[PDB]
Amino acid sequence: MEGTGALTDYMNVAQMTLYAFWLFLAGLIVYLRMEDKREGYPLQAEANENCNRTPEKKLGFPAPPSPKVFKLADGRSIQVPRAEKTDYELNTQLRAEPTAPWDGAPLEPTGNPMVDGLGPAAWAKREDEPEVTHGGKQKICPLRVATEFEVGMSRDVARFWPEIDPDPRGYQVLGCDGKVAGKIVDIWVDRGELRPMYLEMDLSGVGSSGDRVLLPINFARVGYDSKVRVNAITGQQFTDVPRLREADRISPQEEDFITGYFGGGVLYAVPGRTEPFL
Amino acid sequence: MWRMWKILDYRRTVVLAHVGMAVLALLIHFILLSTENFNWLQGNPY
Amino acid sequence: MWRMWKILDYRRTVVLAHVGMAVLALLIHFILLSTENFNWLQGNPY
Amino acid sequence: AMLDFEKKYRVRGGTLLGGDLFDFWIGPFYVGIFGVLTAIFAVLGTVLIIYGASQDTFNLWQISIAPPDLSYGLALAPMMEGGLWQIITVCALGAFITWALRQAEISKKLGMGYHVPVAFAVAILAYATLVVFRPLLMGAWGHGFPYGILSHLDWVSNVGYQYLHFHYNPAHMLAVTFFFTTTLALALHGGLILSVTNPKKGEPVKTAEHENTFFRDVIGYSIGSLGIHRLGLFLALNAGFWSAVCIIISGPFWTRGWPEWWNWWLNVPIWSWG
Amino acid sequence: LTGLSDEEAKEFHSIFMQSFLIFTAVAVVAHFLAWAWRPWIPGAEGY
Amino acid sequence: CERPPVDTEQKGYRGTGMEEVNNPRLRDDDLHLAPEAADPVSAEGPRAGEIYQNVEVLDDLSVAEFTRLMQSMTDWVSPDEGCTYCHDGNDFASEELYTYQVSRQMIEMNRYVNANWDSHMDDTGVTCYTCHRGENLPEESWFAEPTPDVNMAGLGNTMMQNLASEKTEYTSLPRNAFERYLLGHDDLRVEGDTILPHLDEWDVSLQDTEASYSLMMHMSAATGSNCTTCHNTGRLGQWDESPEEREISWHGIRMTRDINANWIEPLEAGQPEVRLGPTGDIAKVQCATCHYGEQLPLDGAKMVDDYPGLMGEEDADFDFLQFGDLGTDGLRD
Amino acid sequence: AEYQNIFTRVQVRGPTDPGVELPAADWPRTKGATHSWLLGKIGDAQVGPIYLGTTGVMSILFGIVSIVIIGMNMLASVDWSPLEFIRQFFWVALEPPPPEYGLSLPPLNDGGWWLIAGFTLTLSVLLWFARTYNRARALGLGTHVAWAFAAAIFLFLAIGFIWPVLMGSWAKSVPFGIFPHLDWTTAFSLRYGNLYYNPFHMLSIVFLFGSALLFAMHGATILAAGRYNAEREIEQITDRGTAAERSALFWRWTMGFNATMESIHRWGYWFAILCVITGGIGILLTGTVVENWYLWGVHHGIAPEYPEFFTPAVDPAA
Amino acid sequence: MWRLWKLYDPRRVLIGIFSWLAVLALVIHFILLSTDRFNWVGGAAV
């Protein structure tokens, strides 16, 4: 093999350039893998997983990097992984019992998994202070306090063809079994993404007309018949949806509480959802 | 027929008319250039 | 006309002129270089 | 070992089949019934591939499990004349289908939608187009691509040149556009998230208002944090879908040179000009 | 409606039409020079 | 759009992707039907060279065989005109019509390629019907690309490319491939024979690659083939990785070049202006002129063994390597 | 029957957003911003405003000149016929200089217009890189988007400028046309022996296919976890919610390993730019240090060998 | 026509007018370059 690019009897420039990239790619994969381990590491190796019968921390390969510091706009510095989120996860006592004593066995919830926070009903530990926008306004807020927002992107579409630009205020909320839980009384909007995040609804169908509860927009099927259908939970289960600490504000922790509860209905809303087809 | 401006937005209609007539005027002048008998710059016999 | 600067922003107009003339000066010099009669580096007979 | 927040999620249920019998984890992997099936299919296919390597060559690039001849039609071939390829093909289809079904069980157990298994089904559809649908329409399993790192590149080359210029394939043009657009969208989305959460050193982490402002400043439109993930999935899935279309119409629905397909455009009465 | 008043709009229009007129006057001379160099309207026999 | 069923034939090893896919509904089934040969005419008596006056090519035929060839040639190139297409009135021995002078050259060419180009046509040969198919002009000829003078300071110079043309099979590839390789003898090879570059030994441009690509597009569609029938496109320049059709088509390029340069072009001066092309040239032979989209012209019907007189003598100076490949002895001026 | 998070059902329209305020040295944004119902179904409905700065305006001017030069040469190539321009729209191009001119300046109608169009287009993308760079800095963001764009420019400059200069001729560069530049792409592979055998072309495809794979995975994961507000990825990075946990757990339980909400964007970022970086490098290698990629593949033992199926052709001129 | 400047921002009109003039003049000069008769840098005889 002769000609330009030859390095030896067998090696050439295009071959060595390729091995230079293999070295760079291997280093990059190590870097990317280390970036993957900034949340959830080191791994908690529970007692049943080891012959020594004692909980251990596992790093894995590559080992997790040094903690990352995020500067926040309000004037705080948060170190990732967060101490209090890990501390909460390794201190809470789950209301669930593993089906078998060996490691890898699934947990069987003891109480009500939807309110206890198991599996799809689980919530993360988040800050209890409601988020704010860059300007300084409340980030997620109902339309009553955020009067600059109107429902419907186009007035003409919402007026003449309201089916494809709906205004779900005043609609009825139906559970997964058709139970009429209540009626939407407000829409919560995110001032940062300009989207409806939740549908506030009274519990008149299953509780009082003055009890307010939040239905996440991604758990709600807003139909063309002035109905909102919630396949996640039963109409009666709306009564246990977590309530807001303040009637006009919602915190990141509260958002996880509410979305966790509705997500719990994927497996636990009705008997048989947790069972296989055959 | 001055009532047309109660229906069509005059400010947008005027801008769209100029852009639209710009495209058309270029289009027609270009069509004439492509022809043998009306390419004035080429000056073919008529 | 001095009143042009109460309609057009002088700060932006100066920048637009400079970047605008940069494009035009580069284009014209390149066109002349891409001709036989005016490529001063090639030095073809005139 | 488990992630420090993983414990509260490892619950029972959400399976499609198998139920409590296979509902457990081995290390980080969820098993399920389809995990046993996908492991059986994967090992069986890989070991059969390695056996096919043993009969030809162990060079990693030169290993090739070739489909049977077109003369065999849709019949199952002898093992060393394309039958091994046919067995591995059904194993690979079984492995891929059980993989997506396993993701459905994991999606249900976590309360997530079935977007990931459905998006992967588009990839399975493209693969099934290559080895089942197109071979079926043309009438022989030999039209499938060989199972080899370098041999299947020669298959793509020759099949593309069977139509003398595969760049002129209209569905291929659309599919490539989606492929190029999705990596442009990925670079933009990946960069934008990193730019916000890793700003110039010293500055605080920016908000979603900065994200919208940045792309409206650059190109005048911002699709939003929800729109970009819809757009990314849309572009990637259309890239997968139109890839299947471009290859399915190459031979069953078009036997001539792909540039000749554009003769309809050249004969439109509006702009014939002759 | 823009901020400009009737006096402001009338003053802009007067200067605009003058400025447009001077622009067209220069182009008219440029076309006279171009015509003196090589005319662009062929006869029946072409050029 | 097309639809199944489609006819498939494997051209390479299984899994290489080398196959031919054909649509049976596209075949004309009549353009490729060879005419029924005339009955075997008795060969006896004096030769047509002495009985007839102005006979130069068909001297060794008998009178009965001469008449049989004339009737067959009439039904091959001009069945709707008859004898008066090449012969004026009651003066059959008059060489005045241009079609007569062209057809005399055509007979010599037909005899020449039938005898010397077995490296491409093997035992099939050709016939007046092979190109003409019962028409005065073959429907698959080509004219040289116009060479419009350029401004060199203007705009829009298409350097023989960037226009959808039927010559390039509706690509933007160079439209002058026929002139370069089927009338000229430009090198078709684009790939280097070495692993590493030798720019002073092999620096073929991408314009020449597209010109070669343009000719290959024609060679595929003109014969009903594709890249795979003559190539393993994964290893394109390897002859041992290519089917024998590549070797046969190699001689087809040189045979087509031989026909145009030596037999067709010398007929340009006598051709009428109505027959000439935009540049002023005579219509030239391409691959489709004999194949008409089929790998075997006229379904491979060997109908030149029934017609002695269309077979010449094997030229002793024929090499098939003297048409631009290491030599230009077989090409004219 | 569940909300699939494919189209936004309920929309809310506030006042049009002027944007985050810039330092008092940037040009004012445009004052035209509207809301589109159709674009609100997919994502953010607001169209505009757009920033026009020094580099932004200059990039448009260079880009317009490039497009005018290309368009006028295309229109002149079809004899100024708009009808033939539409008919030949995919086939027309601005052709590069022929090989005889090498790297010198060719006449206008013999590749000169191509070189001017290529020069101004290069200037416009370079200025657009600076425009993207400055917009990120003006808002106090990282310059990841600009450097991802710079990686794209590298392939753009490698294909069209760097590699032709290394080859010593502008003729090897790519014409400004739709089907003609596809012809260049194919002729490139034909000329240098099946670019499938270029290892960096293989790698560039790995990251191209891996980018579509990653965005399919990530886009579906975020949409599947949209019930838990996963699309709010900044909040999920600084304050890990259950959406980030479920997304990470979904892939960990599937394939044994997982990223974070922040780290998946690093994976997608690097896959996108490696596709274009390796592609540029592979284009630089061919013709310069490798003549025939198939013969190079045979030399390194990667080309498969097939058993006999036909009678091999023999070169008559060999 | 003086009311036209109350309708549209005069700054935006001038930018639109000037941008059109620059584009159109660039196109017209290029058309002349394409012709043999009016290509001044080509130095073509009549």
Ligand code: BCL
């Ligand atoms: C027969 C054809 C050959 C082939 C010949 C080539 C050639 C030649 C090249 C590739 C290249 C690539 N090939 Mg290939 N390729 C083949 C078969 C394939 C197959 C397949 C399944 O068969 C696939 C998936 C690919 C995929 C790829 C990519 C990995 C790579 C292109 C990356 C890219 O995104 O560029 C697209 C992105 C850019 C070009 C950068 C864009 C950025 C710039 C700045 C955009 C500016 C926009 C501008 C301002 C817009 C206005 C301009 C005016 C309007 C004019 N090839 C076969 C073997 N391929 C490229 C490569 O990287 O090689 C290694 C390349 O040069």
Ligand SMILES: CC[C@H]1c2cc3[nH]c4c(c3C)C(=O)[C@H](C(=O)OC)c4c3nc(cc4[nH]c(cc(n2)[C@@H]1C)c(C(C)=O)c4C)[C@@H](C)[C@@H]3CCC(=O)OC/C=C(/C)CCC[C@H](C)CCC[C@H](C)CCCC(C)C
């Ligand atoms: C359709 C849009 C894009 C897409 C989407 C997509 N891919 C996906 C998903 C999605 C949404 C997943 O959820 C799933 C996943 O889990 O990814 C991590 C996956 C996935 N996409 C993968 C690969 C992949 N995707 C590709 C493409 C694409 N994927 C598209 C561009 C390609 C290409 C273009 O080549 C590849 C190689 C895997 C990493 C993973 C699914 C893995 C899987 O099912 O593994 C099962 C277990 C095995 C070990 C497989 C064994 C199979 C056989 C028994 C043996 C091998 C047979 C095979 C035919 C050999 C072929 C070899 C030669 C071709 C060299």
Ligand SMILES: CC[C@H]1c2cc3[nH]c4c(c3C)C(=O)[C@H](C(=O)OC)c4c3nc(cc4[nH]c(cc(n2)[C@@H]1C)c(C(C)=O)c4C)[C@@H](C)[C@@H]3CCC(=O)OC/C=C(/C)CCC[C@H](C)CCC[C@H](C)CCCC(C)C
């Ligand atoms: C990681 C590699 C991938 C990638 C990445 C990438 N591309 C990028 C970026 C990134 C990260 C940007 O930030 C940048 C961008 O702006 O993205 C939105 C861009 C970009 N990638 C683009 C294209 C592009 N990217 C491609 C590919 C890829 N991009 C890769 C797959 C391709 C392909 C496949 O060929 C193309 C064509 C652009 C859309 C943009 C860069 C924009 C640019 O350079 O702008 C200047 C260039 C010009 C030609 C100027 C045009 C000017 C207009 C014609 C003016 C119009 C007239 C008038 C002003 C309008 C108003 C009319 C009046 C009448 C009112």
Ligand SMILES: COC(C)(C)C/C=C/C(C)=C/C=C/C(C)=C/C=C/C(C)=C/C=C\C=C(C)\C=C\C=C(C)\C=C\C=C(C)\C=C\CC(C)(C)OC
């Ligand atoms: C008539 O038309 C009007 C005016 C009405 C408007 C219409 C415009 C139209 C229709 C435009 C159409 C444009 C199209 C279809 C363009 C297609 C473009 C494509 C597909 C391009 C694809 C690839 C092209 C590439 C990659 C080109 C790369 C070229 C490069 C990188 C050139 C670099 C050149 C340089 C840097 C020059 C340097 C000059 C120096 C000084 C260095 O030389 C000495």
Ligand code: HEC
């Ligand atoms: C292909 C290789 C051919 C064979 C074999 C024969 N002919 Fe031909 N012929 C061929 C071409 C390409 C042309 C030119 C077509 C055009 O458009 O100009 C011709 C022309 C003639 C003509 C003249 C027709 C005319 O101008 O009116 C005649 C009379 C003719 N050919 C007769 C002819 C005969 C008798 C043949 C058999 C012996 C014959 N041709 C063979 C291509 C080919």
Ligand SMILES: [Fe+3]
């Ligand atoms: Fe994301």
Ligand SMILES: [Mg+2]
């Ligand atoms: Mg070309």
